[PDB]
Amino acid sequence: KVFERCELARTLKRLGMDGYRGISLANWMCLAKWESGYNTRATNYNAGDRSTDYGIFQANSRYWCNDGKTPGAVNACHLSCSALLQDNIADAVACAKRVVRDPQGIRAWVAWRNRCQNRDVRQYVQGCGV
C-alpha cells in the first residue's frame, strides 16, 4: 500500500510514534518519505552485503527481521521480514520503535541524517490535523 501523506501521519500518531524516545512525528514522516516514499511493500536488495531492506521504514534483514537468506543476521524485532510488507503497519511501527531504543536513536537511519536532520520538517505534518 502507498500511504497518502496525512493518512500516514494520523496512523503513526495513533500508533504512538509522536515523541517516541524523543522523536517528533514530523521526523518519522520525513524518515518514511525518504526510505520508502510511504510504500509498505518497498524492498531493496543490497548486493554488497546480501541484506534486504523491508517496508515503510526499510528495516535491514541483517539486524531487524529474519528473511533466512541474510548471512550472520539477527532478528532484533523478532519478526519475519514478510511482516514488514503488510498493508497494516503495526509490526513495521513496533520494529521501528525497537530500532530507536538503541543509543543511535533516529540516527540509525542514514537517510534521516541526509534528508531530515537539522531541517525544517514541519512540511511533513502540516495540515494533517495531528
- In Å, what resolution does this model reach? 1.8
Q: What's the Cα-to-Cα distance from 71 to each of 44, 49, 61, 64, rounded to whole Å? A: 16, 8, 9, 13
Question: Looking at the annotation, which residues are catalytic?
Answer: 35, 53
In degrees and rounded to multiples of 5, residue 75 shows phi and psi of: -135, 70
**Fold (topology level) of 1-130:** Lysozyme (1.10.530)
- The length of the chain is 130
Task: Provide the β-strand partners of residue 100.
Answer: none
Experimental technique behind these coordinates:
X-ray
d(CA 97, CA 71): 24
What does the block give as the cell for 59? 528495516
Name 107's Cβ contacts closer than 8 Å, sequence gap at least 6.
113, 117
**Spatial strand order in the sheet of 43-46:** 43-46, 51-54, 59-60
Residue 61 · residue 79 · CB < 8 Å: no
